[PDB]
RNA sequence: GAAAUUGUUGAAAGGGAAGGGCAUUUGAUCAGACA
RNA sequence: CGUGGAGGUCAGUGACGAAGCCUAGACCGUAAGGUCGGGUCGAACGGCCUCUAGUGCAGAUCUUGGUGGUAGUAGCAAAUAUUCAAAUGAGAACUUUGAAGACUGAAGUGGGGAAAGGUUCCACGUCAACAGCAGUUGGACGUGGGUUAGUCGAUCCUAAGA
RNA sequence: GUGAACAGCCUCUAGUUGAUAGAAUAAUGUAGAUAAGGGAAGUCGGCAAAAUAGAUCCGUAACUUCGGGAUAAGGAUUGGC
């Protein structure tokens, strides 16, 4: 008859269905617009969400009440050992849209990738790619003409890369393989780069720089079957109400005589694909680098790994991307980081940060000490020890 | 005797019954059907495993609002269950057939079950008390079970009709010249 | 094997509650033949059925 | 083949019981132990000494000690022949504290 | 020892009911007339 | 057109198979229906002219009986709680015994009675039904045994009342 | 035993351990609890819920049929040795 009072609907209809995703690895649905005047490099990267901590930095923003004053800010850390290049795939344009034409593969393939191609690895004869590997033998003939044919046709080129999941504290030995569009100039220059990087390795620093705005593509945490109140942020019904109250009182008018797509119902919650954007990179780590977690002002040699280690993850012994704030997906999940799709000007983007101090105390309680050293200092001598 | 339609040669088959068994008609229907046509030997090892919850029985008719299980994938099915009491009654009949086969002098290694048929025994009446002074039937749904084991025999040779061919005057003018013309 | 009767009889004969009669699990065939009071009697007197002690409710803390 | 062994294990009951309803903690423990014997002895058949039972129920249902020092013994089966020729007896070991011991083989004869 | 209703076996059809009417293909099945 | 029963008749059919029942086999009739074959069955039954009626069903929230879909579904969630081992038995989550853990907490889940029941008591045997899982157990089933009074009640007396 | 107590709570004697069971711990429930800052803004309505409570001492208004109102209200205090 007409609402009575007016309110916004609940929740966004541009995120339906609120279904479990088809895969733990959320898909890159879009790559940066290509400028072929620049050198060749990846346009994304693979890693694993390890955890969060706190940061202190002076903020630089003429006009704000916190100009040249410190702020304290949340950051996530994703574990990011070098990705390894094992294939090139070339796409061509058709009136039916983009279509994959060939894939060329490297000759040798890590067991790490090799075992993604399997479901019962232990029992198997592991024959994956063994006839392919032979194609090199014969001078090279066939792999050439394929590379060669990518070159001739092909509107875009992506690289087949995979993570070195063993360089990571995780249990799962089976790595993550994935296509990354390649944007540096010229089709042929692209596939050469790809050909050149077969079996060889690619670093993060060649993909991201400090203060870059990047996007995170990941599968959201799971929560299972969810009632309507938490899933859609619906009003709790009154305490007096029969047969339950975390519900919707009116699931619909009498006509249309059908529950409609647009009304909140109980169902799966989380495990969704998201493409979260505009996460500025506060740090690019270095695994071989002691004093990862140190700064210009801190100096105290220590790595980013909190005392006792990242809760529910492990240690971070590889290079990492420290990104301001928080990110979709949870600890241990594969996560794609993507080059931004637009040159943002913002001032917020553009501000070149410089960390003053990275927090490094335990996360497994009310952590009181940055380092065993500090703890040793403050506590004195204990009944164990020397 | 007088079992349901069979097509098997009784000289190489043995058979068994239960009548008025207090097992669920519907569950044992599903398990009977699950064993049907099987190698008698593969069938027994199979029922054993059901009892162990290592493989299951696909429910295919009497199965609405049944549970779901990985153990149906074997059979292309999502709903499968593990009907204990059915299985033990069925395998008991099977054990019987075995014994009779042995007695007829039949080769056990060739025994498959070539007929297994459950249908509905007379119901058994018990009753329950519902709200407001009421009473309702509360009923057993029992089963008769019959199976037949038969020795596998291979091949079938050939042999059949001849269809007496019949064709017009002009239909053999072509033919009579088809060969006089060519080969 | 079913010693209820012998147990109840045991309780009655000894003069205390069943909760405290001990039926010796190794003379379980001997006990079973004990159908009568006279033969529970001389089963009690030779340790095949023992009285089983009271449960202390001490007064020490009260005191 | 077989192997016929005795060892003495400590089992963490605390993480196995963490969460479980109070009225099910002693019962759960009986079970979880059985399970523990099968995981080590290979053996579907697991039997608990009536004194072991006592050790478990020593403090009431919900009061199960966080660690137990067991002695698990693999033995051969007897009479009417069960499915499998092996089985395990479990006994409590009279130890001063269950806390602190590695798993040890008992040299039997 | 009918029917409702059921099991098995054989045959057939089935993209949000089924069943029906005129007509013919196809499959199965069968009467008659011929001499 | 069809059904129960009656008079007449065809010296009608039939244990060498009446009647009935089954049959996407045949044939006659526009139709109500009629005829045959084959299977099943077992003792009676039909055509024709007439006579006679308790004479034809889809319904009546029809009567009685039987049967479904629903559905292996709702459910079997109040009364704090169970556990190890032996014994027995085809069979043991549930019986027996031992051990342990608890409960009722003397305003009792203790020890007796009145009304009412009527053998439920007790023993031996024992599981087809019953005890909304089970069963080797039972207030179940089978076969037996058992209730002792000068003093305990009745019986006597009177009450409202009859 | 505690305590004013035949209360509640724990125990001895006696008696039970009966009441389908197993595995999990989604939604929504039923029953039991908690919640920062605000404090009835919720709602027909404080419905529900929360707050209060024993004892000892101190203190106690209008009004009244002088019997009350009254544990009015408002306060302090309480273990062990
Ligand atoms: Mg409006
Ligand atoms: Mg899917
Ligand atoms: Mg090609
Ligand atoms: Mg919730
Ligand atoms: Mg909200
Ligand atoms: Mg939220
Ligand atoms: Mg209400
Ligand atoms: Mg609402
Ligand atoms: Mg923490
Ligand atoms: Mg029959
Ligand atoms: Mg059905
Ligand atoms: Mg059905
Ligand atoms: Mg279901
Ligand atoms: Mg359901
Ligand atoms: Mg459904
Ligand atoms: Mg599972
Ligand atoms: Mg299915
Ligand atoms: Mg009911
Ligand atoms: Mg009821
Ligand atoms: Mg009533
Ligand atoms: Mg011809
Ligand atoms: Mg010709
Ligand atoms: Mg919990
Ligand atoms: Mg008959
Ligand atoms: Mg037609
Ligand atoms: Mg007429
Ligand atoms: Mg007539
Ligand atoms: Mg009549
Ligand atoms: Mg004819
Ligand atoms: Mg005939
Ligand atoms: Mg006939
Ligand atoms: Mg006769
Ligand atoms: Mg007439
Ligand atoms: Mg009439
Ligand atoms: Mg009609
Ligand atoms: Mg009718
Ligand atoms: Mg009708
Ligand atoms: Mg009509
Ligand atoms: Mg009717
Ligand atoms: Mg009816
Ligand atoms: Mg059932
Ligand atoms: Mg159910
Ligand atoms: Mg309950
Ligand atoms: Mg209920
Ligand atoms: Mg029980
Ligand atoms: Mg108590
Ligand atoms: Mg009391
Ligand atoms: Mg009782
Ligand atoms: Mg009495
Ligand atoms: Mg009575
Ligand atoms: Mg009795
Ligand atoms: Mg029985
Ligand atoms: Mg009864
Ligand atoms: Mg029952
Ligand atoms: Mg029974
Ligand atoms: Mg009797
Ligand atoms: Mg009698
Ligand atoms: Mg007297
Ligand atoms: Mg007298
Ligand atoms: Mg009693
Ligand atoms: Mg109940
Ligand atoms: Mg349950
Ligand atoms: Mg609050
Ligand atoms: Mg206030
Ligand atoms: Mg208001
Ligand atoms: Mg106010
Ligand atoms: Mg209002
Ligand atoms: Mg009002
Ligand atoms: Mg109002
Ligand atoms: Mg109230
Ligand atoms: Mg409070
Ligand atoms: Mg007042
Ligand atoms: Mg004091």
Answer for D50: CB within 7 Å of strand F.
yes
Q: Write out the E strands in D1-109.
A: 6-12, 46-48, 67-76, 86-92, 104-105
Under DSSP, is residue B140 helix (H, G, I), strand (E, B) or coil?
strand
Q: Please, what's the b/e burial string for A65-78 (b: 16 or more CB within 10 A of its CB; e: otherwise)?
A: eeeeeeeeeebbbb
Residue nearest to nucleotide F100 (CA to C1'): D54
Cα separation, A237 vs A192, in Å, equals 64
* Strand F nucleotides, any atom under 7 Å to a protein CB: 67-68, 70-74, 80-88, 91, 95-102, 122-124, 129-132, 137-138
User: Would you say A47 and A321 are in contact if contact means Cβ atoms under 8 Å apart?
Assistant: yes
d(CA A109, CA A282): 34
The residues near B118 (Cβ < 8 Å, ≥ 6 apart) are B25, B28, B29, B32, B143, B144, B145, B146
Distance CA A264, CA A11 (A): 9
Q: How far apart are CA D50 and CA C27, in angstroms?
A: 20
Residues 6+ apart with CB under 8 A from A244: A237
CB of C14 lies under 7 Å from some atom of strand F:
no
Task: Please name the helix (run of DSSP H) or strand (run of DSSP E) that holds residue A78, with its range, or none.
Answer: strand A70-79
Q: Two tokens at A113?
A: 């990738």
Instruction: Return the closest nucleotide (C1') to the Cα of A228.
Output: G27
Alpha-carbon torsion (B96, B100, B106, B112), positive or negative: negative
The DSSP line for A244-288 is -SSS-S-S--SSSSS--TTS---EEEE--EEEEEEEEEEEE--TT
> Rounded to whole angstroms, how far apart are CA atoms B84 and B66?
16
The torsion angle over the Cα atoms of residues B167, B169, B173 and B174, rounded to 10 degrees, is: -40
Task: Say what the resolution is, in angstroms.
Answer: 3.0
How far is Cα B69 from Cα B76, in angstroms, rounded to an integer? 11
Around ion ligand 7, residues with a beta carbon closer than 5 Å are A 242
Q: Which residue has the tokens 């040798």?
A: A108
The C-alpha angle with vertex A192 and arms to A188 and A196, in degrees rounded to 5, equals 170
- What does A86-154 look like in DSSP terms, one character per residue? EEEEEEE--TT--EEEEEEE-SS--HHHHTTS-SSTTTS---TTTTTGGGGTSSSHHHHHHHHHHHHS-
Give the residue among A218, A216, A220 at the shortest CA–CA distance from A340.
A216
In the structure, how far is the CA atom of residue B7 from the C1' atom of nucleotide F14, in angstroms? Answer: 38
Q: How far is the CA of D2 from the centre of ligand 72 (A)?
A: 89
- Verify if strand F has an atom below 7 Å from the CB of C23: yes
Q: Which experiment gave this structure?
A: X-ray
Q: How many Cα atoms occupy the beta-carbon half-sphere of A369 within 13 Å?
A: 11
Q: Is the CB of B63 under 7 A from strand F?
A: yes
State the DSSP code for B91.
H
CB A238 within 8 A of CB A245: yes
User: Which of A359, A350, A379 is CA-nearest to residue A305?
Assistant: A359
């Amino acid at each position: 008859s007409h609402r009575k009072y007016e309110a916004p609907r609940h929740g966004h209809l541009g995120f339906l269905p609120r279904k479990r995703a088809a895969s733990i690895r959320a898909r890159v649905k879009a790559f940066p617009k290509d400028d072929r005047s620049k050198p060749v490099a990846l346009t994304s990267f693979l890693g694993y969400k390890a955890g969060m901590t706190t940061i202190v930095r002076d903020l630089d923003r003429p006009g704000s009440k916190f100009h040249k004053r410190e702020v304290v800010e949340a950051v996530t850390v994703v574990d990011t050992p070098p990705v390894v290049v094992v294939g090139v795939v070339g796409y061509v344009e058709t009136p039916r849209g983009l279509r994959s034409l060939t894939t060329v593969w490297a000759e040798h393939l890590s067991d790490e990738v090799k075992r993604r191609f399997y479901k019962n690895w232990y029992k198997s004869k592991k024959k994956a790619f063994t006839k392919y590997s032979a194609k090199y033998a014969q001078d090279g003939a066939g792999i050439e003409r394929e590379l060669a044919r990518i070159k001739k046709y092909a509107s875009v080129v992506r690289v087949l890369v995979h993570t070195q999941i063993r360089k990571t504290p995780l249990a799962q030995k089976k790595a993550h393989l994935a296509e990354i569009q390649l944007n540096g100039g010229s089709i042929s220059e692209k596939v050469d780069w790809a050909r050149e990087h077969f079996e060889k390795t690619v670093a993060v620093d060649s993909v991201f720089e400090q203060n870059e705005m990047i996007d995170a593509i990941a599968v959201t945490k799971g929560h299972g079957f969810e009632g309507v109140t938490h899933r859609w942020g619906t009003k709790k019904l009154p305490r007096k109400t029969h047969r339950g109250l975390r519900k919707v009182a009116c699931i619909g008018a009498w006509h249309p005589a059908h529950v409609m797509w647009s009304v909140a119902r109980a169902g799966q919650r989380g495990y969704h694909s998201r493409t979260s954007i505009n996460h500025k990179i506060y740090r690019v780590g270095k695994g071989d680098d002691e004093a990862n977690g140190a700064t210009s002002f801190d100096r105290t040699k220590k790595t980013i790994t909190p005392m006792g280690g990242f809760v529910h993850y492990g240690e971070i012994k590889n290079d990492f991307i420290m990104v301001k704030g928080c990110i979709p997906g949870n600890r241990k999940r594969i996560v794609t980081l993507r080059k931004s799709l637009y040159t943002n000007t913002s001032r917020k983007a553009l501000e070149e940060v410089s960390l003053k101090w990275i927090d490094t105390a335990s996360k497994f309680g009310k952590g009181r000490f940055q380092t065993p050293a500090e703890k040793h200092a403050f506590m004195g001598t204990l009944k164990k020890d020397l | 005797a007088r079992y349901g339609a069979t097509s098997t040669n009784p000289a190489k088959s043995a058979s068994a019954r239960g009548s008025y068994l207090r097992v669920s008609f519907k569950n044992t229907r599903e398990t009977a059907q699950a064993i049907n046509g099987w190698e008698l030997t593969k069938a027994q090892k199979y029922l054993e495993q059901v009892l162990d919850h290592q493989r299951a029985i696909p429910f295919r008719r009497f199965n609405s609002s049944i549970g779901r299980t990985a153990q149906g994938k074997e059979f292309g099915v999502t709903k499968a269950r593990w009907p204990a009491k059915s299985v033990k009654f069925v395998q008991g009949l099977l054990q019987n057939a075995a014994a009779n086969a042995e007695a007829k002098g039949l080769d056990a290694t060739k025994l498959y079950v070539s007929h297994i048929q459950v249908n509905q025994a007379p119901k058994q009446r018990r009753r329950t008390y519902r709200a407001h002074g009421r009473i309702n039937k509360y009923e057993s749904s029992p089963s008769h079970i019959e199976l037949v084991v038969t020795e596998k025999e291979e091949a079938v040779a050939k042999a059949a009709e001849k269809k007496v061919v019949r064709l017009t005057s002009r239909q053999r003018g072509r033919i009579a010249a088809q060969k006089r013309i060519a080969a | 094997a079913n010693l209820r009767t012998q147990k109840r009889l045991a309780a009655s004969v000894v003069g205390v509650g069943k909760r405290k009669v001990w039926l010796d699990p190794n003379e379980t065939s001997e006990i079973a033949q004990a159908n009568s009071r006279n033969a529970i009697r001389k089963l009690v007197k030779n340790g095949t059925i023992v009285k089983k002690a009271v449960t202390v409710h001490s007064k020490s803390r009260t005191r | 083949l077989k192997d016929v062994v005795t060892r003495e294990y400590t089992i963490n009951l605390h993480k196995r019981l963490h969460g479980v309803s109070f009225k099910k903690r002693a019962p759960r423990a009986v079970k979880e132990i059985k399970k523990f014997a099968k995981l080590h002895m290979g053996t579907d058949d697991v039997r608990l000494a009536p004194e072991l039972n006592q050790a478990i129920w020593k403090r009431g249902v919900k009061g199960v000690e966080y660690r137990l020092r067991l002695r698990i013994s693999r033995k051969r089966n007897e009479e009417e022949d069960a499915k499998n020729p092996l089985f395990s007896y479990v006994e409590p070991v009279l130890v001063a504290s269950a806390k602190g011991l590695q798993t040890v083989v008992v040299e039997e004869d």
